[PDB]
Amino acid sequence: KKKVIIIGAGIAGLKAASTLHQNGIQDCLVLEARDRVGGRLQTVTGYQGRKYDIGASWHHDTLTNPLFLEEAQLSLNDGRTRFVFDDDNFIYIDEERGRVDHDKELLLEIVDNEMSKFAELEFHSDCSFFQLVMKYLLQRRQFLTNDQIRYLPQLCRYLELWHGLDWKLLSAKDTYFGHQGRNAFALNYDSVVQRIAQSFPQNWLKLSCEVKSITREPSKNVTVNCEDGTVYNADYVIITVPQSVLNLSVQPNLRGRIEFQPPLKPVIQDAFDKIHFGALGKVIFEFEECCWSNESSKIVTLANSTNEFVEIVRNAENLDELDSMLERTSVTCWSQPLFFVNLSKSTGVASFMMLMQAPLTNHIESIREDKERLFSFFQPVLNKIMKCLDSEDVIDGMRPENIANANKPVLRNIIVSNWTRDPYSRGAYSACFPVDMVVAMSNGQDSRIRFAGEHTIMDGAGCAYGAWESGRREATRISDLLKL
């Protein structure tokens, strides 16, 4: 009854629809499991109507990012502000010393560069970003001070926030990856979603439709059917659900899962072994008003470091001696690095958007509803930030004020992501464990069972534009064929 059925209203799915329609193509559908489009792009509303992208929030590689360029043109055309360039000089904070960024004697960023060049060279078998950092420290200790060896490895972990994976879980071979230029903070990714979503017939979209199985009818027909009984049949099928969800079509009923008939060709099934997903998480701390210095919009808190980490480095005879000397509990805000976006400086909002990673993410998302517990967990670093930003310890104003505020940051609310605990996202996005999936998805189960999504592309992989393009790809293809 339909031409092509798009599964998923994320930006990939939306783009595909947007394209088809842009090609006159008619009679198509977008089946979304949730009661909203946007997929991993969701803007939520907090205190006083402040808006926040709980999922994606940046246009990466603005130099080449084609989705960003389109937004840029729209803005050049109507003057509407769609994004702001928020890259800033990062501020790094260690519980003990405090600020360790742009340091006269620590010069951490410079060694971090060397560390980077080292990794480029090292490759050009693959270990963990952690192991790699350790190899470097060992291999260059002769040229590193005691303080550099202490904090450098901590500071360099900000990369855990780019992947949303701790350094012992992260692939070093994929850890470093130069970005094609500055980043632009989307002042409404929801505008992008809304703009694309309303660029095709609104009657194509069918929300709360969890597709349970895709059956191939050799007779040049495809049987799609949401688990609510309703069955559809279209010429072509573009599957845009997350890799983590798709990755369920190979296990022995779980929600979101799509039963493929016939099974997914092996090449694809193998890929799920050579590619994993990450768990980047977000916590929004909403303050009554800014009462801290807006020196920068990017702040990173370093996990605790031990002056006895040095002695071990200063001793190991090799990666085996060091490897063992290392294996020689409790999880707090200081157990890992935490990336804080000070929205006050870059968007004029008295809030902090903090990014977290696996394994911490999953745990904090677990207690998303426990505000007193959440505040208690982040209070230390929150206060450590305010001090460094010439302010006072945070007051808890989440419940009906204090009067003793005025000069003290008054927390009014906290918003936590829920991607790990959401059955339709089961994670943040494609991430590397210490590749081929791109091809497996690009080719497609067949001439009519295509794949799209941030995990189905090489350029922009794991990104909004990467997904946006993959949606136009598989689309523009099915656009010409049908056109016939």
Chain residues that interact with ligand FAD, rule: CB under 6 A = 7-13, 31-34, 39-41, 55-58, 60, 209-211, 240-242, 245, 256, 258, 280-282, 417, 419, 424-425, 428-429, 453-454, 462-465, 467
What does the alpha-carbon distance between residue 471 and residue 30 come to, in Å, rounded to a whole number?
Answer: 12
CB of 460 to a second copy, least distance (A): 15
Q: Which of 109, 113, 104 lies closest to 89 in space, CA to CA?
A: 109
CB of 81 to ligand FAD, least distance (A): 18
Sign of CA dihedral 465, 470, 473, 474: negative
Q: What does 151 bind: a second copy, ligand FAD, none (CB cut-off 5 to 8 Å by kind)?
A: none
Q: How far out from the chain centre does Cα 81 lie? A: 23
Helix (H) or strand (E) holding 72: helix 66-78
Q: Which of 155, 113, 175 lies closest to 304 in space, CA to CA?
A: 155
Q: Please, where are the H alpha helices in 287-340? A: 307-313, 319-326
Q: What does 334 bind: ligand FAD, a second copy, none (CB cut-off 5 to 8 Å by kind)?
A: none
Closer CB to a second copy, 117 or 274, in the complex: 117
Terminal Cα-to-Cα distance of the chain (whole angstroms): 18
Task: Provide CB contacts within 8 A for 103, sequence distance 6+.
Answer: none
Q: Is 26 in the site for a second copy (CB under 8 A)?
A: no
Q: What does 12 bind: ligand FAD, a second copy, none (CB cut-off 5 to 8 Å by kind)?
A: ligand FAD
CA dihedral defined by 302, 307, 309, 314, rounded to 10 degrees? 130
Q: Is 185 in the site for a second copy (CB under 8 A)?
A: no
Q: Is 459 in the site for a second copy (CB under 8 A)?
A: no
Q: Is 110 in the site for a second copy (CB under 8 A)?
A: yes
Q: Which of 91, 48, 80, 87 lies closest to 349 in space, CA to CA?
A: 48
Among 70, 95, 109, 227, binds a second copy (CB under 8 A): 109
Helix (H) or strand (E) holding 438: helix 437-443
Q: What does 178 bind: a second copy, ligand FAD, none (CB cut-off 5 to 8 Å by kind)?
A: a second copy
Which value, in Å, is the radius of gyration of the alpha carbons in the chain?
24
Q: Is 458 in the site for a second copy (CB under 8 A)?
A: no
Q: What does 386 bind: a second copy, ligand FAD, none (CB cut-off 5 to 8 Å by kind)?
A: none
CB of 425 to ligand FAD, least distance (A): 6
Q: Which residues, 315 to 344, sit near a second copy by CB under 8 A?
A: none
Which amino acid does the sequence have at 387? K
Among 182, 195, 206, 265, binds a second copy (CB under 8 A): 182
What does the alpha-carbon distance between residue 143 and residue 140 come to, in Å, rounded to a whole number?
Answer: 5
CB of 402 to ligand FAD, least distance (A): 32
CB of 99 to ligand FAD, least distance (A): 25
What DSSP string describes 83-142? EE------EEEETTTEE-TT-TTT-HHHHHHHHHHHHHHH-----BHHHHHHHHHHHHGG
Task: Provide CB contacts within 8 A for 370, sequence distance 6+.
Answer: none
Q: Is 295 in the site for a second copy (CB under 8 A)?
A: yes
What does the alpha-carbon distance between residue 369 and residue 18 come to, in Å, rounded to a whole number?
Answer: 36
Neighbours of 252 (CB within 10 A): 4
CB of 256 to ligand FAD, least distance (A): 4
What is the three-class DSSP state of 170? coil
Among 2, 21, 51, 87, binds a second copy (CB under 8 A): 87
Q: What does 296 bind: ligand FAD, a second copy, none (CB cut-off 5 to 8 Å by kind)?
A: a second copy
Q: Which of 471, 434, 351, 425 lies closest to 56 in space, CA to CA?
A: 425
Q: What does 56 bind: a second copy, ligand FAD, none (CB cut-off 5 to 8 Å by kind)?
A: ligand FAD
Question: Which positions from 132 to 161 touch a second copy by CB under 8 A, shown as an x/- string?
Answer: --------x-xx------------------
Closer CB to ligand FAD, 305 or 420, in the complex: 420
Q: Which of 479, 426, 423, 484 lies closest to 450 in space, CA to CA?
A: 479
Q: Which residue is nearest to ligand FAD (CB)?
A: 10
Closer CB to a second copy, 89 or 261, in the complex: 89
Q: What does 89 bind: ligand FAD, a second copy, none (CB cut-off 5 to 8 Å by kind)?
A: a second copy
312 contacts 137 by C-beta, under 8 angstroms: no
Closer CB to a second copy, 36 or 179, in the complex: 179
Among 72, 74, 127, 482, binds a second copy (CB under 8 A): 72
Sign of CA dihedral 213, 216, 219, 222: positive
Pairing, β 91-94 against β 298-302: parallel
Closer CB to a second copy, 72 or 326, in the complex: 72
Among 121, 403, 404, 484, binds a second copy (CB under 8 A): 121
Among 24, 49, 79, 178, binds a second copy (CB under 8 A): 178
CB of 304 to ligand FAD, least distance (A): 25
CB of 298 to a second copy, least distance (A): 10
Q: State the residues that interact with a second copy by CB under 8 A.
A: 62-64, 72, 76, 85, 87-89, 102, 104, 107, 109-111, 113-114, 117-118, 121, 140, 142-143, 178-182, 184, 295-296, 345
